[PDB]
Design a protein around this nucleic acid. Structure first.
Lengths: 80, 60, 114, 24, 206, 155, 127, 98
RNA sequence: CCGUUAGUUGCCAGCGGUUCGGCCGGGCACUCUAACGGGACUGCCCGCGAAAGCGGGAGGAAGGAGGGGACGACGUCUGGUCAGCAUGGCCCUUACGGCCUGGGCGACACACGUGCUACAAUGCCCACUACAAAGCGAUGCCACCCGGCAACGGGGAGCUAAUCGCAAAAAGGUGGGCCCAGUUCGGAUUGGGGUCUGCAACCCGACCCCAUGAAGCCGGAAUCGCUAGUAAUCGCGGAUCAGCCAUGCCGC
C-alpha cells in the first residue's frame, strides 16, 4: 500500500505540494487543480479541494483508495 | 471583431496546454489547419479571389 | 472435466472448456489450454485425470475466476466504492462505469426503459 | 465483431496489432 | 442565393493568380501571409489614386509587386516622390524590398471594379442610384465593351426597407465558364450600413 | 421507364457450364458480391446432384425450373371506382426470374446445416415435384385465378 | 514468332505476351490456376484462346498485377486476345463476337456531398 | 554527371525551365537527359461554401507539385552557362545536385 | 479510341551478364506517363420523314449528348446567416469589457435524430496462402534486433522524398477447431494487463491484457436507400491532430 506507484507521483502540479509540506503534517484541503494525476503513496489520508468544475469541494483520501487518477475522486455533474 | 482575444500569439503556452490554433484572416480558431492557417472561409473565399498562390479549383 | 465450477468441456478442446467457466472463454481458454497442455483440437470427452489434475491443480492458487473471481472483483470494487475515488463513481448509481455519457442511452446498467 | 476488440475482427478494426498481429 | 465566384469561373481560363509565385510545404502559408499584410496596407494607403489590382509576383526572394491603377499622376508623384515613401516603407513588412511596379491601364470603361468603386462612392455622396447604375453601365460598356451587366444590392439608397436593383446592355454570359469578363463589387458607406454593389463587363471571348 | 423498355441486361454464361441460367442462379445464391462462395455452393450442391443422385445436374436444374416457373396469377385494377383481382398469363421473363429467386429462397428455407445441402435438397425436390419453392408456386397459381370472373378485365 | 496482347481495366493491369510454345502461363510468377486459387476466375484468362481454338501450342508469359485477382485476370484475358490480334490480324468473325473492345469504364466512381455510395443519401426516419 | 529538380506550380513554369535548360545546355553538357516529369503530385481540400451549418454547401480544389528532373551527363564545363545564367521562367526554382 | 514528344517508372516485345528481386548493361517501341492533335457533324448502307430526328447495320476506343466531374439562369422563401468577417442603428461600461483557479456546455424518469456493432455457419475460431488505391511522412513518417501475455520501451537504419518512413488492404485461397446452444456468436456493462499525446487526464481521453459476460436467435402501426460497377459488402489513406470518444466528414 499505496506503492504501487513510487514515488507517490502527482503530476508535480500536486506532487510538489504533497511532499515536504507532508513535513509539518497537514492543514487539509489544498484546492487541487491538475487532477490528471495518479494519486499515490503518502497521499494516503489527506484533504484537498477537488475542482468539480465550479466549486472546490473538500476531499479526504484514505488508504486503499489513494492512488488512482485524481479526477475520478470528485464528481462533476447532477442528474436525478 | 473579437479584439480582447488576439492574445493567441503571446504563446506563453505556460503548459503547452493553452496556446491554440487559428485563421490568420477571419480569425476563427475553429477549423484552422496549417499550411493555410485560415478559417475554412477567410480561407476558401480569398482563395476564390485567387491572390492565393497557384492552388486551383478542383475537377474530375 | 469437473473443475472449480464443474465446467466440463464437451466435444471441444481445452480452451473451449475453461471459456465455459466463470470469467473464462476467449483469452481465458488460451491460457488454460496452454498450461493443462492439451490439443485445442480435442473435442473434450476423455480428459484423463492423470493429466487433468496437473492443470486442474495449478488452476487454483493462481486462477479465479470460479468461486473466487468475485473476490478480486468484489474486494477491488469495494475500495473505490468506499473512497472518494472515481473508478467506482460511474457505478455509484447505475450508469456505465467504462464510459460513457449518461443522460441518454445507458439502460445496460440503469435497467429497463421507463 | 469489430468490437470483439480482442481477437481478429477486433484488431482488424482497432487498427491495432499487438497480442493479435505482430507489427508485421 | 448562390452562383459561383466570377473569378473561380475564370481560373485556368481568363484571368489568373494576381499574386503569382510558388513555395510548397511548411512556408507557402506565411509567404502569402506577408502578402496580405502587403495588398492590405497597400490598397489601404493607395486606394488614393483609386488603384485597381495588385499582382505581387515571386520567382525568387524579392516580391515583384506590380499594382495597377490608371491614375499615374499622384501615383508616381510630382516627379517621383510618391513611389519613394512607398517602395521604401515596403521593407517594413518583411524586408526583401521590391521594385515599386506601377501599372496604369487604358480606359476605366473596361474597368468594371473601378467603375464600381465609382458609382459606389457616388451613392456615398448621396443620389439617384438607379440612374447611377443605368448610365454607369451605359457608358462602361458603351465606350467599347461586349456588354455591361450591373447590379446593386442592399438598402436602396433609402427606404427603412432594403432592396435590390439592376440593369444591363449587350451580353454578359457569366455562365459559359470561359466568358473572359471583368467583375467587381464596392463597399457601401451610407449610414445604412453595408449595402454592397456589383457590376460585370463582358470582355468578348470568341 | 419514362417511355422506353429500359432493356433486360444480358449475362455472360456459366464459368463452369457456359450457361446463362447458371450465372443468373449463382448471382441469386450470392451476396456482398462473393461471386466466389456463390458459385461455390452452386457447385458443392451440384456435387449433391451427381452424388446423392446419379442423375445429372443439367437435367435436375432444368426440371426444378419447369416445376417452379409460374404461369397464371393476379394483380388488381383500380379502374372503375374500384380495384378487382384479375389474373393474367405470368409472362416468361418474370416466370423465370422469380420462380428462380423463389426457388433459391425456399431453398434457403430448407433444413440441413450446409448451403450446398439446401440448394441440393430443394433443386432436386423441385425437379421432381415435392417442396417449399414450387409448391408455393402452385399456391400463387391456382390461388390466383380464383378471381377468375375478374380475369376477362385484362392486365 | 511472337504476339502481344494487352488487357487492363479498372486499375488492374494484365499485360499478356504469347509466343510459339505450349500451354504454360507465368502470371508475373506462377501459372494460371495456380495463381487463380480455386478461382473459377482461372478460365477468364483463356477465353481469347478458345476464340480460334488450341490451348496447348503456345507459351504464355504475362506481366499482370494491380487492382487484384479478377480485374487483373480478365485484363489478362482481353490481352491474350490482342496477342491473337497480332498473330492473325484477320480474325473478325471470332475476335469480335466472343471478342472484346476497350477496357470497361465502371469503377466505384465517387462520393461527393456525402451519401458515400454515390446514391446512398442518408435514409430518412419517422415524421 | 548532374542531377536536377525544378519543382513547380504552374504547368508552363516547369516548361520554360526544363525547356531552356535541356535545349540550351544542348551546346554544353552531354546534351542533357530529357526533362523526366514525375507523377505530378496532388493535394485536395474541400470546405463549406455556405458559411456556418450546412453539411452540404462546400466543394473543393487543390494545390500540388509538378516535377521536372532535367539532368545532364558529361560535366563538360561549358554546360554550366547554357542554363545557369541563360534561364527564363518564374513559377519554380533551380534545384541542382549531382 | 489512335499515332505525335520521351524515356531513372515502366519494357523486354530481342540477349548478354543474372547476385535471376528486372540486381548489372542494354534496348524506347510495348504497360507506364505527363503533354499534342485526330476521333459520328444522324456524317454513310437499310426504315420513316416536307423537315428536325428516332429508329435498323457495319466501322470501332466508343455516338446515339462515351460513364464521371464543375455550371444551379428568374424569383419564391422576408428561409439561414447572434459569436465567420464585414454592418446601420441600440444598449454598454469599474464595467454586458480582461486575465487567472475549478465546474460546465459529455447533469439524467423520459422522446425523437443520425451512425456503430448484433443475433451467425453461404458463420465464428486459427494457421499458412494469393493482389490496389488515391493520399499521407522533417525535427516526421519510422527500417530490423534487443525489453515485448500486451499498450508499448530502446537501439536504430531511410529519406531527403514515382527509387526512402507510413502499409499488416480485408472478403478471396487450403487444411485445421466447432455442428447449430445463447453457442467460439454477441461482445454491453462491470472482470484484468499494458500502449500513448498530455503535468495534470476525478470529472472530462485513446489503447493492450486480466476476470466478468447481460439484450439480442433479423425487430409492431410504420418508416428508408438505391438503375450496373450500381445495391450490397471489404478494406487504405486524408484535414482537425503531443491523447481523443472519428462507429462522424472526405477521397480512393
Amino acid at each position: 500500500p499505496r506503492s504501487l506507484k513510487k514515488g507517490v507521483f502527482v503530476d508535480d502540479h500536486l506532487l510538489e505540494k504533497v511532499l515536504e509540506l507532508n513535513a509539518k503534517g497537514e492543514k487539509r484541503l489544498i484546492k487541487t487543480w491538475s487532477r490528471r494525476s495518479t494519486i499515490v503513496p503518502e497521499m494516503v489520508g489527506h484533504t484537498i479541494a477537488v475542482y468539480n468544475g465550479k466549486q472546490h469541494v473538500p476531499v479526504y483520501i484514505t488508504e486503499n483508495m489513494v492512488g488512482h487518477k485524481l479526477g475520478e475522486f470528485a464528481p462533476t455533474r447532477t442528474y436525478r | 471583431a473579437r479584439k480582447a482575444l488576439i492574445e493567441k500569439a503571446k504563446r506563453t503556452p505556460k503548459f503547452k496546454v493553452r496556446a491554440y490554433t487559428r485563421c490568420v484572416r477571419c480569425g476563427r480558431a475553429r477549423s484552422v489547419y496549417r499550411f493555410f492557417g485560415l478559417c475554412r472561409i477567410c480561407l476558401r473565399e480569398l482563395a476564390h479571389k485567387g491572390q492565393l498562390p497557384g492552388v486551383r479549383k478542383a475537377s474530375w | 472435466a469437473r473443475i472449480a465450477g464443474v465446467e466440463i468441456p464437451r466435444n471441444k478442446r481445452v480452451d473451449v472448456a475453461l471459456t465455459y467457466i466463470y470469467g473464462i472463454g476467449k483469452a481465458r481458454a488460451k491460457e488454460a489450454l496452454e498450461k493443462t497442455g492439451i490439443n485445442p483440437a480435442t473435442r473434450v470427452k476423455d480428459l484423463t485425470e492423470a493429466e487433468v489434475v496437473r492443470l486442474r491443480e495449478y488452476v487454483e492458487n493462481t486462477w479465479k475466476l470460479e468461486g473466487e473471481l468475485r473476490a478480486e472483483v468484489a474486494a477491488n470494487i469495494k475500495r473505490l466504492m468506499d473512497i472518494g475515488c472515481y473508478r467506482g463513481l460511474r457505478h455509484r448509481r447505475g450508469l456505465p462505469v467504462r464510459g460513457q455519457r449518461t443522460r441518454t442511452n445507458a439502460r445496460t446498467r440503469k435497467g429497463p426503459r421507463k | 465483431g469489430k468490437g470483439d476488440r480482442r481477437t481478429r475482427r477486433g484488431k482488424i478494426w482497432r487498427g491495432t496489432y499487438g497480442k493479435y498481429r505482430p507489427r508485421k | 442565393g448562390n452562383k459561383i465566384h466570377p473569378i473561380g469561373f475564370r481560373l485556368g481560363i481568363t484571368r489568373d493568380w494576381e499574386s503569382r509565385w510558388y513555395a510548397g510545404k511548411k512556408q507557402y502559408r506565411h509567404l502569402l501571409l506577408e502578402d496580405q499584410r502587403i495588398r492590405g496596407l497597400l490598397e489601404k494607403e493607395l486606394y488614393s489614386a483609386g488603384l485597381a489590382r495588385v499582382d505581387i509576383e515571386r520567382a525568387a526572394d524579392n516580391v515583384a509587386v506590380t499594382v495597377h491603377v490608371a491614375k499615374p499622376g499622384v501615383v508616381i508623384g510630382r516627379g517621383g516622390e510618391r513611389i519613394r515613401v512607398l517602395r521604401e516603407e515596403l521593407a517594413k513588412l518583411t524586408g526583401k524590398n521590391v521594385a515599386l511596379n506601377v501599372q496604369e491601364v487604358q480606359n476605366p470603361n473596361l474597368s468594371a471594379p473601378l467603375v464600381a468603386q465609382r458609382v459606389a462612392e457616388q451613392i456615398e455622396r448621396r443620389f439617384a442610384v438607379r440612374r447611377a447604375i443605368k448610365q454607369a453601365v451605359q457608358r462602361v460598356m458603351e465606350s467599347g465593351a461586349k456588354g455591361a451587366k450591373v447590379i446593386v444590392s442592399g438598402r436602396i439608397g433609402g427606404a427603412e426597407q432594403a432592396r435590390t436593383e439592376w440593369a444591363a446592355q449587350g451580353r454578359v454570359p457569366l455562365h459559359t465558364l470561359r466568358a473572359n469578363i471583368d467583375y467587381g463589387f464596392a463597399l457601401a458607406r451610407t449610414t445604412y450600413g453595408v449595402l454592397g454593389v456589383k457590376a460585370y463587363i463582358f470582355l468578348g471571348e470568341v | 421507364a419514362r417511355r422506353r423498355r429500359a432493356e433486360v441486361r444480358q449475362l455472360q454464361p456459366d464459368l463452369v457450364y457456359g450457361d446463362v441460367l447458371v450465372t443468373a442462379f449463382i448471382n441469386k445464391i450470392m451476396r456482398d458480391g462473393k461471386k466466389n462462395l456463390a458459385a461455390r455452393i452452386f457447385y458443392d450442391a451440384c456435387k449433391i446432384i451427381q452424388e446423392k443422385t446419379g442423375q445429372e445436374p443439367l437435367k435436375v436444374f432444368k426440371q426444378a425450373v419447369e416445376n417452379v416457373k409460374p404461369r397464371m396469377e393476379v394483380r388488381s385494377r383500380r379502374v372503375g371506382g374500384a380495384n378487382y383481382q384479375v389474373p393474367m398469363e405470368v409472362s416468361p421473363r418474370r416466370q423465370q426470374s422469380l420462380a428462380l429467386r423463389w426457388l433459391v429462397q425456399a431453398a434457403n428455407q430448407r433444413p440441413e446445416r450446409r448451403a450446398a445441402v439446401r440448394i441440393a435438397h430443394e433443386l432436386m425436390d423441385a425437379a421432381e415435384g415435392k417442396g417449399g419453392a414450387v409448391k408455393k408456386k402452385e399456391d400463387v397459381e391456382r390461388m390466383a385465378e380464383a378471381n377468375r370472373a375478374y380475369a376477362h378485365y385484362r392486365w | 514468332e511472337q504476339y502481344y496482347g494487352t488487357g487492363r481495366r479498372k486499375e488492374a493491369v494484365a499485360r499478356v505476351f504469347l509466343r510459339p510454345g505450349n500451354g504454360k502461363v507465368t502470371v508475373n510468377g506462377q501459372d494460371f490456376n495456380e495463381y487463380f486459387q480455386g478461382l473459377v476466375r482461372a478460365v477468364a484468362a483463356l477465353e481469347p484462346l478458345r476464340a480460334v481454338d488450341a490451348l496447348g501450342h503456345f507459351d504464355a508469359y504475362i506481366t499482370v498485377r494491380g487492382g487484384g485477382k479478377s480485374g487483373q485476370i480478365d485484363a489478362i484475358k482481353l490481352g491474350i486476345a490482342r496477342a491473337l490480334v497480332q498473330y492473325n490480324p484477320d480474325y473478325r468473325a471470332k475476335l469480335k463476337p466472343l471478342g472484346f473492345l476497350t477496357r470497361d469504364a465502371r469503377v466505384v466512381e465517387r462520393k461527393k456531398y456525402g451519401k458515400h455510395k454515390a446514391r446512398r443519401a442518408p435514409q430518412y426516419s419517422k415524421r | 554527371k548532374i542531377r536536377i529538380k525544378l519543382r513547380g506550380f504552374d504547368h508552363k513554369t516547369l516548361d520554360a525551365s526544363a525547356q531552356k535548360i535541356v535545349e540550351a545546355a544542348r551546346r554544353s553538357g552531354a546534351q542533357v537527359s530529357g526533362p523526366i516529369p514525375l507523377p505530378t503530385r496532388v493535394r485536395r481540400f474541400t470546405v463549406i461554401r455556405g458559411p456556418f451549418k450546412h453539411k452540404d454547401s462546400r466543394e473543393h480544389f487543390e494545390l500540388r507539385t509538378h516535377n521536372r528532373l532535367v539532368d545532364i551527363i558529361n560535366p563538360n564545363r561549358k554546360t554550366i552557362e547554357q542554363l545557369m545564367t541563360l534561364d527564363l521562367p518564374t513559377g519554380v526554382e533551380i534545384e541542382i545536385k549531382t
